[PDB]
From a paper:
N-Acetyl neuraminic acid lyase (NAL) is a Class I aldolase that catalyses the reversible aldol reaction between pyruvate and N-acetyl mannosamine (ManNAc) to give N-acetyl neuraminic acid (Neu5Ac). The catalysis of reactions involving fluoropyruvate as donor by N-acetyl neuraminic acid lyase (NAL) variants was investigated. Despite a report that it is not a substrate, fluoropyruvate is a viable donor. A combination of mutagenesis, structural biology and computational chemistry has revealed insights into its catalytic mechanism.
Numbering used by the authors:
A (entry chain A), B (entry chain B), C (entry chain A), D (entry chain B): 3 to 293
């Protein structure tokens, strides 16, 4: 498949022991495709609480998400881990399930050299033979990739693109110009309109689980040149994003899904549950925007 | 004169002793208006090497720049200084010359509280009675202004707007929505197109001294919805900006102006002159983009 | 046991598949106690490449290290993980082996609230019933703990102390004064002398695997008031530390151990092996300091 | 006069219009020497609100402070400015008054290259022919100086030392070792004891205006090896520093001086006066430590 389009970063519901609720996960995956009308799922990303999970649980999430959607739906599997053996194990498993591409966060925590980071990507690709999307998230990792470093990664024919999240539209424009044939998917929901006019091929986001229909309008209207209409929809989307961030984003998004009849469970500790102090303000937002 | 529009941040040529060359300053001012077709000048900003000047030289720059241009040209006087007495003296001086508004950088160096910063603006206004534009440049000052802080400043009727430079389009969008009737001029030339679609009322920029005609097209095309054409001109403009940044932006911009026959002098020490190692690369840029 | 003293942060040797070499691990543990004359081991810390390992491998490292040392040797088990279920599983396993205390890195990657971080610690303690040492490493995690936050943690009778690494001797002094009866172990080998005079109870370090005898002299001489002698030994130790950092610290420390006849193996990918370009310079250092 | 020793960073009292109160400035200078028993004054530093003053006021402060004290008192004149012409004028002026050395903050605000910073120092020296002390204060300037950069500066015979404030005792130790014959004066009052054991030749500090007698004991006791006693006085001194920092350090220090009957005036706007909400807490501190 052409991997352009809009993707939900799949949220995962848990029980009080931090185990995956598979029936709720199935519902969330179906919500993103059937109700939010998205093109695909980005599975076991940050938004899925992936870095709090064990290896068997990550496989559970990949299996369930793949079983919950039709064959037209695009699937990207985030397999990055500080344990390269585990990234490779996950990448094979996701590839064999039929995921269209793998993705991996830049190695973090330790002050890896860029050559070490480069060869992490190359090693995953060698072992899996699948296409790879760089997951660049300096806000969480503290790792920043320069254009020269992007050029060295993109020189590999199987590094087909990037999930781009640095709040830097100068660097985004330089990448877009230097690599016209690579895939760039923006990961900053609150700046989708600016990404869109900067030539991104689509976007991956946690908030698209609840606001995917407005997001598709932002994208489509901006590309049409109906720029005032698209920005108004960005203003509305940012009211939502700002609100859910103030309340704790992943649990609050899951509370929005619960309101729709989904068995949305709990976050995985050490994330705490949605605080009920925020309930009235969340209710007003859901009403105001028909969420 | 409502102050929407495109402004050159006026560059200043010095002699070997760091004194102002009034003739070249006049030629730079005229170039911005006549040749680059800009709406106005932002005078004694960062780009004017203002923070390296003495008081008498800052007054000199204000007088020369205003004498150089006709009465239809919009003029904003940057008068911020760590010396509040100096800021007020300069503010009265520029106000008496007939500058259309004042602007002031946030106090920097010392860890001032927000109340101290707020009351610096309020004291400048009380003493000058001119309208005031906040100059927000965290990349240089390390001072960041939150939405709640902007709300407090903008609650003052004579704080009419902001020269906004933080590389944050979420904050920009929140400001635009919260203050639909304040003036927002963006100060990041390399992200003019994203600023424009985010609803800015114009822009102030050092590179507009050499590339103001493309900048006008970006701003006009984007607001008309010809977003792909506007973005292509951003790509071209970003080749120029990236190149001059790599060579030393203020001296390199003055060297491009010297190519047009302007007496562009030298930077003020401790800035060094343009390094002739860059000459070949500069000539290729000038030829490629007809600068 | 009283947990005061000097500890090696245990290094782990791997094969090319990233599996633990148990015979080499045994040798490294014996090196730290018998040759370097240290008081204990800090097991599965950052220096042991812990965050690159799977759960079964972490258990392997705990088992082997415990089997390699006598009953007088103090053992601290680092069990922090982003997976709380795994931290608890490891904490029980290490407790049942007889480790004297558990330790856990502050949760990282996600922007956890402090209440979330607090209850991660409290949850581990509830499940394991062992004493707990906070592992504060802002250089790697980006998480900073304030004195007020330290006070809330130390209010728990089973949080007995901290492995302190923030490069902040004002905060260290405030903690030392506010909590005279808690255990403070410094983790910055290059500032051991300053830690010692700031009243730390001991120190944990990767470089003590090769330089533990000088480190004990720094500590003992500084406490005696032989401050010039202790600082001279810090100058010598910092030549070593600076050198090994420039070459890649964990592999280079392991190459020093290899020189002693230890089966020191390889780092775990994505860490690369020691580069042989550095061999001559490493040889000169080993000679100069008898390592 | 070799310039080792303990210096007050001289505080300046202003009237309501931000003009210097020469009588109170004299009383502050005399207090530092007579009552606090210090070796010298560091004049027109950050603590003197120097960066808020005009040129004529900076000269005024130099003249008043030197007239206030006897010829045995060591005097260092801070003359750094973003205006290099001003720095040279002030340097010549202080040199003619008989100041024992000059000092200068690293140029800040603009992103100057290291060559530009290096040649600012060299140009001040060439024009003044006085000895020069680097004022390194990254907390305020955002400029950090590496060991290799220090090597280049110290290769100049008239750069005799540094006022060192970076919170980095590894760098301090490397500098002390590499340059055994340069003057290193530390500028972090709250870490005087750690500086002293790291081999500094003295210290410059704003809190020594009120607590110089304890500071002398810390410095002397630590160099004698009575490290526990020196550290207890650091604990006491840090109660004072933490308290004044929380209240607004320069106005709060002047308020402590007003308690001794000194005409301590006001801070220069945009600094606000001491907030009387803090009065009770300040009085308790003054009583507890006999300030």
């Amino acid at each position: 498949k052409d991997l352009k389009g809009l993707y939900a970063a799949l949220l995962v519901p848990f029980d009080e022991n931090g185990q995956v609720n598979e029936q709720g996960l199935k519902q969330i995956a179906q919500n993103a495709i059937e109700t939010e009308e998205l093109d695909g799922l980005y599975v076991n990303g940050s938004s899925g609480e992936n870095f709090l999970l064990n290896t068997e649980q990550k496989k559970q999430v990949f299996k369930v998400a793949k079983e919950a959607v039709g064959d037209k739906v695009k699937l990207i599997a985030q397999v990055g881990s500080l344990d390269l053996n585990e990234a490779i194990e996950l990448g094979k498993y996701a590839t064999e399930l039929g995921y269209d591409a793998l993705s991996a966060v830049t190695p973090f925590y330790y002050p890896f050299t860029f050559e070490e980071i480069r060869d992490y990507y190359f090693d995953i690709i060698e072992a899996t033979q699948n296409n790879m999307i760089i997951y660049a998230i300096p806000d969480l990792t503290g790792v920043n990739i320069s254009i020269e470093q992007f050029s060295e990664l993109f020189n590999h024919e199987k590094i087909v693109g990037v999930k781009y999240t640095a709040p830097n539209f100068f660097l985004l424009e330089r990448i877009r110009k230097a690599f016209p044939d690579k895939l760039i998917l923006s990961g900053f929901d609150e700046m989708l309109v600016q990404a869109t006019i900067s030539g991104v091929d689509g976007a991956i986001g946690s908030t698209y689980n609840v606001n995917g229909r407005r997001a598709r309008k932002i994208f489509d209207l901006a590309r049409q040149g109906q720029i005032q209409e698209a920005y108004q929809l960005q203003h509305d989307s940012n009211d939502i994003i700002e609100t859910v961030l103030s309340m704790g984003i992943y649990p609050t998004l899951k509370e929005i899904l619960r309101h729709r009849g989904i068995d949305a469970g709990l976050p995985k500790r050490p994330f705490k549950p949605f605080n009920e102090a925020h309930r009235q303000t969340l209710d007003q937002l859901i009403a105001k925007y028909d969420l």
